[PDB]
Amino acid sequence: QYIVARPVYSTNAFEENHKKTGRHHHLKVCCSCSPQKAKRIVLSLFPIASWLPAYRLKEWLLSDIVSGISTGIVAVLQGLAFALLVDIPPVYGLYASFFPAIIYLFFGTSRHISVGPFPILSMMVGLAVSGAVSERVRVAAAASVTVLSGIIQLAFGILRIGFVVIYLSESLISGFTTAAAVHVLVSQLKFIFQLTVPSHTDPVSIFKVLYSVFSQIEKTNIADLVTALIVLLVVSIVKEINQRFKDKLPVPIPIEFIMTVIAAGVSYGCDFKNRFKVAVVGDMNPGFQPPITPDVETFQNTVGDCFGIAMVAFAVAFSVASVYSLKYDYPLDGNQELIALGLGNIVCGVFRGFAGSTALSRSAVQESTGGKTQIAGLIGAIIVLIVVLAIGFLLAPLQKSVLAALALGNLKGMLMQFAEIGRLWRKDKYDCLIWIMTFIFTIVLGLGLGLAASVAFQLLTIVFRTQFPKCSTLANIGRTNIYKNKKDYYDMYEPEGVKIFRCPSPIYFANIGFFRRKLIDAVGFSPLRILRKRNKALRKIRKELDNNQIEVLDQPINTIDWNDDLPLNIEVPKISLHSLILDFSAVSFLDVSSVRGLKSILQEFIRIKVDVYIVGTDDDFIEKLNRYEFFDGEVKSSIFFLTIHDAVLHILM
Amino acid sequence: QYIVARPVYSTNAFEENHKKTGRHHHLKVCCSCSPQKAKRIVLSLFPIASWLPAYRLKEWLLSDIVSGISTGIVAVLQGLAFALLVDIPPVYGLYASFFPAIIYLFFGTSRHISVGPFPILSMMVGLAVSGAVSERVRVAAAASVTVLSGIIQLAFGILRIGFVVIYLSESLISGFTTAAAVHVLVSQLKFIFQLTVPSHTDPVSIFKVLYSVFSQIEKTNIADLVTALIVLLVVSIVKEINQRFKDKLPVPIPIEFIMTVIAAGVSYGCDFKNRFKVAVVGDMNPGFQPPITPDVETFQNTVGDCFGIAMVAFAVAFSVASVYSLKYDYPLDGNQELIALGLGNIVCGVFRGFAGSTALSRSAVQESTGGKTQIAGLIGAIIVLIVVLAIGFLLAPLQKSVLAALALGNLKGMLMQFAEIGRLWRKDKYDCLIWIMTFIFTIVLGLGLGLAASVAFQLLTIVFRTQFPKCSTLANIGRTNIYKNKKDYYDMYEPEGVKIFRCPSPIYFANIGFFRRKLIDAVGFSPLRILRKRNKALRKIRKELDNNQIEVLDQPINTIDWNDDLPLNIEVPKISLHSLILDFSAVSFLDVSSVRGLKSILQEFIRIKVDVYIVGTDDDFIEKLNRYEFFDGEVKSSIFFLTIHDAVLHILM
């Protein structure tokens, strides 16, 4: 059974019978050079010196040839299809899937990540250029939003503050990216229907596009729509074949290559360019561009949106890479992800590309084909190299909506997150409000400002959880040490005069007005009204008054018991209370707005000659109240006890 | 002593031995007319029917004559001195201390409040007009910011959401009003030095004024500065006499009247207007103005700042009135303060005034002179009535910096709050960061936008408090039920295999990545690395692999004990752990981002054949985990226990 025979401990009669350890509680141990300290700094800022000299060549090379080619053809056709969401020339989407792939080979700490562009940052870059102009003024201003968002990411992995991704819950991540998969689905209607839409901008940007597209819906094309519904149907159902047959199917079907060759083959020979009037990708010039210096007139007016691109490029890079970090069991450094993607978006921004990070629909192509290391991300950048230099004379008959339909086949994973009202409403109803208020703020205020006002509302639902706590009143079940809520069981014996209270929440500025109101409700009387009625009855003994003298009615009584008949017609109220336990077990923290309100209600309750105890606090909660100066000659330190049946056994003896 | 002899209860063997009450857990009880329901609705929306028919005429009339006159002369001279902070004609400061004083007599629930203008809302109105223009275009646009901020206040006391004032701690209130007492001290330099400064606006508005004042500092006046230093010296030290001699001095010295009569007497007879060149208050026209209709072109561009004036006019009205509510012991309704000040700022905004609420330096004049009810706020509006109609031909020789020095004598109470770095740094250091980040955001971003970015940072210091909690590991002290931290005492016996953990914080999105990291640190091993090494050793028994087949290595084992020698060269690691208690006593709440991470680490720890218990949770914490579907055929409901010595007594038997 359960037998205890210890004496009654009062947390100051416990720290004298049982001595503490008295153990000692920065700028010398860290700022100190050592031959064993700078070894693991250089091999942690440059981690290619930790997987390249240990490379299993017989086992990992042939899996990294066939999985670097299979993500090379995906990186080309996704690269051209994301340069159109920014409305720059399409060759600038192959300078953004090659230059971050070389830099992340050296400084990168993840091993199953294919780095390039991805459609949530082809719009946040695409909406920042329209907010920095007001194609030569858009190429040179999309490659200066990249350098600004690569300096902010580099100056966050140097200050070692790469724990910012914990401020984004899964309801805020599955609410933002579901609303970002509608902005992608809407802004890819300029290229399927072949309509000339102006570049909209500020708030409510999706309904400005839907008003401009559907006002020209009689001017669409039939040779540009039946080839974006044949492509959208086949590459969806063949991708349905692959994820249904992940077994019994080695090296699954590359539908993103064999559909383009059909579509670029039919457009050269049936002459879709001059028979119909369909837009095609132009003739790209073979070769790179000279580097450019970013201008300050682009930095000044879009400094508020490169704090949005720099915290979206990392929150996708740390959500995707942590999927393969718990699957293949290797440690992942969250600050090396900020340096290797701060240097990727500076080199690719200087060399005229645009911003980007890892894509979930491309990293799963590298991971499922058999990519073991980031050598499959190097050979996935030799094929983007040979397309730029050598074979760029192909992909000119590509029909500019085969590209705009391949980027709509990837929106199955990000639009099936709508079945979270069907789950979070039945479960939480606070994290179903963060899903709704993120889907509304993003689709109205835009992508960039829909994350500032959604994180700030996500922090209002920690205050809403602990604003009106369920304050209780406890009682004893079975003459033992079990103290549970009084309105729940049957034989609960609460003793004579004792009134156990319980606040199951941390007490702070949003919580002390409710705890003080509920304590004087669940005790029967207010303690300040009965101090003033006693002092009025004491002044009548020694014998009303105006203002500035009511301050003497709240003084402590200095002389009777105030419970029997007073010898004149005096009607001061009586109380049966003579103790008040407080269960501070579930209280996590106090602050200076809650200590000054708790000290106020312990001082009223003591001057009525009601002994107030506080019960359940650990070692750190009492050692912090020594620093608020909570204790004085009235509120002693012998009011703290250990457990509830410890304090009640002290009252009855 | 302390003896217990109960059996061991496991919170499901407790709710069968002790039956619950099964008690039942809105639109019918409230939406129901009744002859006893509409009585206390009409007498609570119109509370002059609850103190006027019970008025002690012999005791409260002569204290309300002499304390309505003493706040009448203050309301006139403060009214003219706050119409200059908005830069309108000075007669429009007597239409703002008279019309809110009549409406608050009827609908007002406080009894020691003098209603008028006050210098923090003569600048928030004064900076909104400069943001709505870009004197006839400033009079008609300061009386439309008033009507917009009176409709927002009326539509917050009708929706019954007047608990918004709990989102503002005392560190955010003593940080905002200290920074608002520097904006007042700076913007009263246009009238002491007699300098013509253009109307400024947007961010960094105090340094734009200090640059414009001190660039003309050779063009000041000597007849306008020696009369704002004689006035500023005497009315400060005589107000030092009153608060030093609150006893032995009945009806304290009205220095704000006897100094003006001297200053308006010397300016008529020594001829300060034509000898020197000093600015004076003009000749006010006797009478009111016709009402105006607010234009929509003022409503559209300043809808973002009348959400700042409407939540500053209430946070001063509920901070001042709660001082006299706990002193004179009457209940104060926080929603009737929003209706009676929503109707005050509509009537006074239609009749060409400006916005306002109660002032701390004027309500203390009414309260200390002997004002008992709001009849002293009616006679304090008959004297503002006779100054407008009859004796407005006086106060024309008033020198416009006697008025600008009387409003600098009130900044002693709001500038002595700078000694809170000397208190909050030694005590809290989180609520000393809210004092600093509010003083910086207000003095840089302005008054209106310095409260949006200071409340939003105040909610980041509840996340900073519970981001890195002090996770512990407990042990037994003296073979009893006392379980405290292991690195604190000496004879702490932790049993064989048991590993008691403790998280002293609510677990949520900012807390589950740290609790999972600290649990596998304070247990010795990771539980997922040792599940995969067992399954690799089991496949070698029945006999590496590529991707999409590593998902079978995290499966539960289905067949040995994995603690002795395996019959081949197999080096799966061993564990001594066979239990894991978790102290969830201090855990307040869980959410869907923390349940999905806690369920993940209970499922890894059970498949290693390690029995995981969760200990310390009340009745409501288990009844919410039935709604997250935390329980299945693996994580049962018999893992919850009552207390720590209850679970450890179950392990050892």
Descriptive report:
Two copies of one chain form a homodimer. In chain A, 39% of the residues lie in helices and 4% in strands. Chain A contains 30 helices and nine strands. By secondary structure, the first copy, chain A, is mostly helical. In chain A, helix 5 (99-107) runs antiparallel to helix 18, helix 8 runs antiparallel to helix 18 (344-350) and helix 9 (170-187) runs parallel beside helix 23. Chain A folds into two domains: 57-390 and 400-451, no CATH class; 472-541 and 571-651, STAS domain (Transcription Regulator spoIIAA), CATH 3.30.750.24. In chain A, strand 1 and strand 2 (483-485) form a beta hairpin. The longest helix of chain A has 18 residues, at 170-187. In chain A, the strands form three sheets. In chain A, strands 1, 2, 3, 4 and 6 form a five-stranded mixed β-sheet that branches. Chains A and B meet through helix 16, helix 25, helix 28 and helix 30 of A and helix 16, helix 25, helix 28 and helix 30 of B. Chains A, B: Residues 86-87, 182-220, 327-337, 396-432 are extracellular. Chains A, B: One of its GO terms (cellular component) is brush border membrane. Chains A, B: It catalyses: hydrogencarbonate(in) + 2 chloride(out) = hydrogencarbonate(out) + 2 chloride(in).
